[PDB]
Enzyme design. Structure first.
Site, mmCIF file in Angstrom:
data_model
loop_
_atom_site.group_PDB
_atom_site.id
_atom_site.type_symbol
_atom_site.label_atom_id
_atom_site.label_comp_id
_atom_site.label_asym_id
_atom_site.label_seq_id
_atom_site.Cartn_x
_atom_site.Cartn_y
_atom_site.Cartn_z
ATOM 1 C CG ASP A 1 -15.576 25.429 25.840
ATOM 2 O OD1 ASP A 1 -14.841 26.256 25.245
ATOM 3 O OD2 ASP A 1 -15.682 24.232 25.486
ATOM 4 N N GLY B 1 -15.577 11.661 25.330
ATOM 5 C CA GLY B 1 -15.929 10.408 24.669
ATOM 6 C C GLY B 1 -16.676 10.668 23.375
ATOM 7 C CD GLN B 2 -17.001 6.775 20.492
ATOM 8 O OE1 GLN B 2 -16.703 6.367 19.366
ATOM 9 N NE2 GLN B 2 -17.233 5.952 21.516
ATOM 10 C CB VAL B 3 -22.180 12.675 20.661
ATOM 11 C CG1 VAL B 3 -23.647 13.068 20.581
ATOM 12 C CG2 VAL B 3 -21.503 13.435 21.792
ATOM 13 C CE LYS C 1 -20.739 14.992 26.618
ATOM 14 N NZ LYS C 1 -21.042 16.350 27.153
ATOM 15 C CD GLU D 1 -33.754 19.342 23.311
ATOM 16 O OE1 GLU D 1 -34.744 19.398 22.544
ATOM 17 O OE2 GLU D 1 -33.338 20.313 23.981
ATOM 18 C CG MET D 2 -31.597 14.230 16.935
ATOM 19 S SD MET D 2 -29.888 13.695 17.166
ATOM 20 C CE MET D 2 -29.350 13.690 15.459
#
Ligand SMILES: CC(=O)Nc1nc2ccc([N+](=O)[O-])cc2s1
Length: 342
Positions: free
Chosen positions: A154, A38-40, A55, A106-107
């Site tokens: 990964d 999906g997205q972040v 997320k 956390e960013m």
């Protein structure tokens, strides 16, 4: 016409809008990441008074079940940390919002691929590469904890972010592809460049495959280019063969997918299959690293930390990280003992 009351799109992704406020808590800034899951997004938390990265998982059972496995692992890892002195990204909390499971992290700052791009793929110093290599070896040491025994599965430059843009402290992200050491369910694993020989050969794998991935990554951080840039599995294997030679017979006698790349002559010895490539093990790492020629393309001539003695310590560690045999491939603990880290 409309999906999820007009919140979702074709591909089950929440339509992120700037300046939206969720649960009277999170103020949405802008989209920052994208992937299968999906997205972040970049969000500010009014409670904790800090920037966070949310997320937003796709509204579909398949992706939501994958995300729930990641949460399990992140909470399991974060439970054995608390101090955050083992370089795994921190899952703060999670929740459901408009049928999307969100994971608040956390960013972190830009990733290592973004760093590579900013060098025009000419790489970074050995002093900075050491720092990354030290933290990652510690991170893998953490994952090797018996109760964890986690395989990221990964590792690539995009899954390694900096805490702060003016520091060298890093965090590993994205444990969606990860699973704890178990019996072999999946076979097509890892990103192609960083895919171990055992995976390419379809043999039993374990936490050693992450080590291979680190080896490949570390060279690439310094040279600036992928070590083994295969356009497909056959090419990928042939680029490895160029550097390290032909895998040992006792490996290839076991390998289910041996014949995809090699051939067993009547003597009982393996050679390549003609499809191009330098002969087995003649594109030496010594030469790629530029041990005795001022580093990658001579760009590190007469810089502190880039002597022949330094490069030789770097080279030796990497060759142990790229050991064909996963039973002999250097373990995180002994990588940290290596003289490259004095
Ligand atoms: C892209 C950017 O500027 N900052 C980002 N920080 C984080 C932190 C964690 C995760 N994550 O999915 O575990 C993703 C991102 S993206």
């Amino acid at each position: 016409k409309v999906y999820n009351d007009g919140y979702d799109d074709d591909n089950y992704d929440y339509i992120v809008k700037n300046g939206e406020k969720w649960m009277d808590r999170y103020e949405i800034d802008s989209l920052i990441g994208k992937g299968s899951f999906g997205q972040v997004v970049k969000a500010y938390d009014r409670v904790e008074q800090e920037w966070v990265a949310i997320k937003i998982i796709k509204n579909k059972k398949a992706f939501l079940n994958q995300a729930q496995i990641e949460v399990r692992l992140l909470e399991l890892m974060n439970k054995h940390d608390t101090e955050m002195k083992y370089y795994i990204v921190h899952l703060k909390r999670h929740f459901m919002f408009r049928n999307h499971l969100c994971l608040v992290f956390e960013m972190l700052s830009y990733n290592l691929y973004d760093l590579l791009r900013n060098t025009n793929f000419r790489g970074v110093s050995l002093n900075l590469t050491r720092k990354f290599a030290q933290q990652m070896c510690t991170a893998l040491l953490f994952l090797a904890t018996p109760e964890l025994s986690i395989i990221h599965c990964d590792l690539k430059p995009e899954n390694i972010l900096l805490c702060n843009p003016k520091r060298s402290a890093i965090k590993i992200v994205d444990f969606g592809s990860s699973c704890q050491l178990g019996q072999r369910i999946y076979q097509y694993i890892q990103s192609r460049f960083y895919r171990s020989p055992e995976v390419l050969l379809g043999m039993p794998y374990d936490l050693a495959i992450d080590m291979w991935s680190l080896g490949c990554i570390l060279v690439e951080m310094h040279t600036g280019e992928p070590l083994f840039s295969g356009a497909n599995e056959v090419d990928q294997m042939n680029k490895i063969v160029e550097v390290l030679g032909i895998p040992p017979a006792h490996i290839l006698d076991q390998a289910p997918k041996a014949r995809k790349f090699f051939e067993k002559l009547p003597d009982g010895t393996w050679n390549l299959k003609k499809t191009e490539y330098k002969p087995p093990g003649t594109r030496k790492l010594h030469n790629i690293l530029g041990v005795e020629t001022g580093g990658p393309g001579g760009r590190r001539a007469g810089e502190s930390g880039h002597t022949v003695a330094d490069y030789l310590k770097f080279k030796d560690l990497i060759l142990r990280m790229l050991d064909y045999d996963p039973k002999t491939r250097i373990q995180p603990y002994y990588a940290l003992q290596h003289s490259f880290f004095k």
